[PDB]
Structure 1
């Protein structure tokens, strides 16, 4: 576990890069990738039940006044960590210089959709945010039945809450059983990514790869570790517990698919179920510091590859636009590169221009490698804020 997952990650990238330099990326896509795809299928299987069941129980166990206080805390935390990741990525884009080696030249509906019109349908087809909304309303209604003067109502409410909790506790036991297959699933996914896109990390694409990974490492040290030290949390013991969720996120490149592993990690470190069952699923789609840092670095790569000087006001409007795009990015692999296109239409750089689509295509050739570092930071920011908010209730 603590060694076999690291073994599969290291040995898989070695087997991936070796088989990638030869050109057998089509061979690992046939015989190796299905073992990693299966590992993701199992984790995606548990997302909707483990989110809905844990939140009905958690929103009941906690008081609505405290639950709303956690939302105000975790949202202010999410907006600040993402805004810091962009300004850290822009700084990392200027410490390095990606784009100088190549010489080219040139809402209300979303809020209302949080409220589902059919929670049975919401559970049926993904939709974590509508599920989060209905599960909170349900759990809060459950405990208002606990205070009923009627005996039949209290027994029926306790029965439903227990059955729901029985489902929740069941899903967590499945994660511990699925994570036994992680060394094989980790080995397979890291090898497929390193085989297909490991050859593409050359030259200016190797610069933007190092500019992002250094920014992500600095995001963990200068932001997450510092904030954990300020709120009195040992970072080394935190990474030891989050090691399973961080590597699973780095490997599956899906914050939504890693979500059952992160909620187990938060449970395994004693965080109240009324907090992590609400911040982790909401943070799996809103808190994306790794995506916010990646989109800030690449927007500078586009502007530098095209020989355009970005004013301080333009660098400022990039931060506000990337944070908006950081939230709109899905917790699925490759979503950040698609959302990067919307951040380029705001600075007046359309993808219809051939030189814009050229550099954008270059990023796609290494997007999955950058996607690994993105999701791990998108997920760590969810656990870091959950632990800090739970530290202050």
Structure 2
């Protein structure tokens, strides 16, 4: 019994270091909290956590583009459509199951919007690809193009480009071979970036915990709702569909959930979720390159629940809330504080004052660290479900 735990410590070396990083980060952050805090000085303190974020952001661009180009090229017309339909149906249901779970819990325990739709439409079709790799569109930072990255515009273009090569046969093969080499090469860089994660995660959360009262019971509604949907609803869905153990599946992606908690960005933790599914859970690359990049921005289960709870909490009808909370879920990017920005849209539709968001902002960060964990988990189990379901398509692609 105790001799068997030594084989666990030798193997899970990096997984236990990121756990210890959280345990130490919560300690050090609370230890350095009574000291005279400063914006400039907190920025200096949280710098080892800042370098990890830069390393992971560096890899999101060559991952998104290479994954979707090879991923769609490697599949037939009806195959990618069937693969897509299995993913979309899953994405639509899980975000609807989350908002229904969110609305019921907030009802039981009660504690420029056109421009937004236009900007998103403008972002699905970028005017410049070199630009899209570091800028997004936000109508009104110079002009209407905000510094970021159009993750959605790249996902949409790379998809049609991957389809085009998968339609031009052997002429397309060269570029597919080129984009395949690049996908693996960056997946070798995420191996290097993985040994820095325990040091980074420690400082990312220690710095964040160095920063009327009714919000405590609002924070409870969200956190409880995330556990019911995350550790009870989603594992049940996987066990019902795949007929496989979900809590041993969650053990593989556990290294990525901790980094989602540390960074609070599902797009920035994508290179690690890719490594955790392809390696630890042994999910097919032909489907992880398909499910995960789209899952980063479109499937946001934890955000959808947070959009429903926070909208009804500031009321201190439901049909419009459930429709726009699922709408805000899809819209919002896998970036920190994204839910808070899309909350402006979910409050305008119902008729509540948008200035009421100011009450939430203070707590928001701590809920976002868990919101991302459920947003990531929904894609990991999503890929696990789609891989298992698309069994016949994958068997046809082999010889």
| TM-score (norm. length: structure 2) | 0.83
Tell me, yes or no, if structure 1 residue 96 matches structure 2 residue 109: yes
Alignment partner for residue 245 of structure 1, among 256, 277, 284? 256
Q: Which runs of 5+ in 1 are unaligned?
A: 99-106, 147-153, 197-201, 305-313
Counterpart in the other structure of 1:281: 293
Tell me, yes or no, if structure 1 residue 141 matches structure 2 residue 154: no
Tell me, yes or no, if structure 1 residue 81 matches structure 2 residue 94: yes
What do the CA deviations read for 1:46-81 (whole angstroms, capped 9, x no partner)? 011011112222212222211111221211211111
2 CA distance for matches of 1:74 and 1:158? 26
Counterpart in the other structure of 1:329: 332
C-alpha contact 1:172 1:260 (8 A) present in aligned 2: yes
Instruction: Provide the aligned C-alpha RMSD in A.
Output: 2.2
Tell me, yes or no, if structure 1 residue 303 matches structure 2 residue 315: yes
C-alpha contact 1:16 1:192 (8 A) present in aligned 2: yes
2 CA distance for matches of 1:124 and 1:25? 30
Counterpart in the other structure of 2:353: 350
Question: Structure 1 pair 190/205, CA: closer, same or farther in 2 (3 Å)?
Answer: same
Tell me, yes or no, if structure 1 residue 176 matches structure 2 residue 191: yes
What do the CA deviations read for 1:269-327 (whole angstroms, capped 9, x no partner)? 332223221221111111111111112111121112xxxxxxxxx12221111111111
Counterpart in the other structure of 1:382: 379
Counterpart in the other structure of 1:308: none
> Which has the higher mean CA deviation after the structures are superposed, 28-37 or 316-325?
28-37
SS in structure 2 of the partner of residue 271 of structure 1? coil
Alignment partner for residue 194 of structure 1, among 195, 209, 218? 209
Tell me, yes or no, if structure 1 residue 320 matches structure 2 residue 323: yes
Alignment partner for residue 370 of structure 2, among 366, 373, 388? 373
Counterpart in the other structure of 1:29: 42
Deviation at 1:22, TM superposition (A): 5.1
Q: Which runs of 5+ in 2 are unaligned?
A: 1-13, 112-116, 136-148, 391-399
| TM-score (norm. length: structure 1) | 0.84
C-alpha contact 2:260 2:269 (8 A) present in aligned 1: yes
2 CA distance for matches of 1:96 and 1:192? 32
Question: Structure 1 pair 338/117, CA: closer, same or farther in 2 (3 Å)?
Answer: closer
Deviation at 1:108, TM superposition (A): 7.2
What do the CA deviations read for 1:143-168 (whole angstroms, capped 9, x no partner)? 4443xxxxxxx3x6433322221111
Q: Where do residues 41-52 of structure 1 align in structure 2 (5 Å cutoff)?
A: 41-52=54-65
Deviation at 1:9, TM superposition (A): 1.0
C-alpha contact 2:283 2:384 (8 A) present in aligned 1: yes
Counterpart in the other structure of 2:51: 38
Deviation at 1:219, TM superposition (A): 0.7
Question: Structure 1 pair 295/145, CA: closer, same or farther in 2 (3 Å)?
Answer: closer
2 CA distance for matches of 1:390 and 1:175? 23
1 CA distance for matches of 2:340 and 2:191? 32
Higher relative contact order (CA 8 A, sep 6+): 1
2 CA distance for matches of 1:4 and 1:25? 29
2 CA distance for matches of 1:290 and 1:348? 23
Deviation at 1:389, TM superposition (A): 0.9
2 CA distance for matches of 1:270 and 1:229? 17
Counterpart in the other structure of 2:305: 293
C-alpha contact 1:55 1:274 (8 A) present in aligned 2: no
Give the paired residue count. Answer: 357
Alignment partner for residue 211 of structure 1, among 206, 221, 231? 221
C-alpha contact 1:142 1:157 (8 A) present in aligned 2: yes
SS in structure 1 of the partner of residue 333 of structure 2? coil
2 CA distance for matches of 1:21 and 1:330? 34
2 CA distance for matches of 1:15 and 1:297? 32
Tell me, yes or no, if structure 1 residue 162 matches structure 2 residue 177: yes
